[PDB]
């Protein structure tokens with residue numbers, strides 16, 4: 001037999017065995033997240049360990065088939081996914097140490113606490129507490145206390161662990177035939193053996209940097225505008241030409257500027273659209289929320305939710321004696337079983353989350369026919385882009401009207417528009433520079449371009465230059481500020497938030513053009529457009545069977561990540577911003593710091 005037709009038989013055996021073990025493991029996890037019990041956690045952990053052990057025997061059994069001796073690119077993909085050693089490429093004593101380090105960093109992050117200087121017995125965890133403060137406090141000193149203490153007490157515990165961690169990780173990566181751990185992560189965008197859609201790992205770094213350059217003007221103006229607003233909020237604490245102090249941005253790191261809305265809102269008098277009241281007066285409930293979301297998809301040519309989705313889904317919190325995790329989540333348990341777990345509340349926010357989450361299900365259903373290993377988004381950043389796209393259309397004033405949740409009496413002004421776009425930009429645009437800079441620092445650390453003795457130095461040099469943000473206190477190499485962020489100490493790649501953001505607007509611009517939308521992109525609603533739903537579905541059913549470059553193309557007509565659509569979305573705010581900054585200093589000096597004097 002040929003090491004192709006036997007690989008095909010190996011794969012066929014895997015899919016049937018895998019589909020069944022993944023289903024048992026999924027069902028077990030679903031029981032525990034819907035009915036937190038002691039035996040339900042038992043059933044789950046065991047069903048999960050049976051799946052991991054299967055995946056390992058199957059991986060170290062697929063090696064047998066020479067990747068080069070393979071032709072059918074579709075079988076190469078599957079085979080590729082499977083024969084990935086990863087950490088198992090390490091010697092038992094190493095793997096053991098790496099796992100200990102990961103668990104340790106993880107626990108000090110979720111369990112570390114800081115205590116009040118004037119009361120050693122009043123101690124706060126990051127969540128909630130420090131988070132509550134960083135999001136709501138308007139006191140410069142209290143915010144500074146929380147920012148520095150988090151990094152001083154827990155971040156420093158992470159420093160030692162993080163260094164050993166990159167060593168061990170780069171080792172895993174090299175032995176797996178990659179340059180370094182960061183090169184390993186970029187491996188998610190790599191596509192080969194396909195003329196015209198190939199994509200290099202290093203090519204990710206340059207498309208990110210090239211697209212980032214085009215975003216800079218919008219960011220600088222957003223930066224100059226909020227920097228002037230924060231000056232009124234913190235009189236005499238900030239320079240007209242300086243970086244924004246790190247502890248004044250709305251969350252513990254400045255990942256999103258979302259919480260800077262009350263201090264930066266362009267027209268505080270105009271009412272912020274919020275139907276979370278009109279839903280109540282109409283006696284709306286969880287069922288109606290998801291039924292309306294379901295109706296939204298069918299309106300563009302997608303299928304109804306499945307029978308069973310409605311029966312097996314936990315769309316409401318069971319209350320007391322039925323403890324469950326309420327984080328909204330979309331499940332693809334296998335064998336055509338789809339479910340959404342969410343403790344739905346009658347709010348505008350949950351009406352949008354339902355669309356986002358039902359967006360994921362739709363994506364899961366569209367590619368259910370692909371073999372097991374190809375059932376996922378084209379790349380790490382597609383699923384959330386698809387989910388975010390749904391809320392965009394559902395929140396538009398035009399959508400809320402046609403649905404009867406917003407009366408045709410709510411006039412939209414050029415001011416309610418800028419108010420909305422600014423709010424959007426604080427989350428969406430504010431996070432792009434933060435995200436790119438954080439991953440850049442890690443990429444460089446993994447490559448070895450930043451000596452342990454210059455980690456923090458380079459970190460803050462980069463915060464000041466790229467993000468235009470400065471540390472309130474100086475930090476030596478004793479600190480590990482990037483690790484005080486969940487994704488860093490919890491070992492998750494971060495660039496996906498950058499790419500997903502650019503993808504979502506490419507998708508949205510594409511679907512809206514296919515929907516014959518007329519005005520500004522941010523007012524678009526794709527409802528009723530089967531032409532939009534068809535274009536969306538052409539890439540959705542692909543799963544990961546095609547290069548992501550092709551799945552993108554099937555939707556936007558181009559094979560690469562492009563920032564123009566994001567910019568088009570924000571153009572109205574961008575022109576307003578420029579005029580607002582007519583007399584302001586746009587940009588920043590990297591010399592200034594809160595302590596320079």
Ligand SMILES: *[C@@H]1O[C@H](CO)[C@@H](O)[C@H](O)[C@H]1NC(C)=O
Nearest residue numbers: 008009071072073074075076
């Ligand atoms: C790869 O194999 C599958 C089934 O094993 C077959 O249906 C498919 O056409 C092959 N891909 C191509 C077109 O080479």
Ligand SMILES: *[C@@H]1O[C@H](CO)[C@@H](O)[C@H](O)[C@H]1NC(C)=O
Nearest residue numbers: 063083084085089175176177
């Ligand atoms: C995984 O490790 C095994 C043995 O250590 C090796 O034979 C195999 O080539 C590795 N997988 C690949 C192709 O990276």
Ligand SMILES: *[C@@H]1O[C@H](CO)[C@@H](O)[C@H](O)[C@H]1NC(C)=O
Nearest residue numbers: 299398399402403525527528
């Ligand atoms: C979607 O189609 C229905 C069917 O006529 C229509 O009533 C509804 O208003 C459409 N959605 C919008 C707002 O375009």
Ligand SMILES: [Cl-]
Nearest residue numbers: 253481482484
């Ligand atoms: Cl930081």
Ligand SMILES: [Zn+2]
Nearest residue numbers: 356360384387
């Ligand atoms: Zn999501």
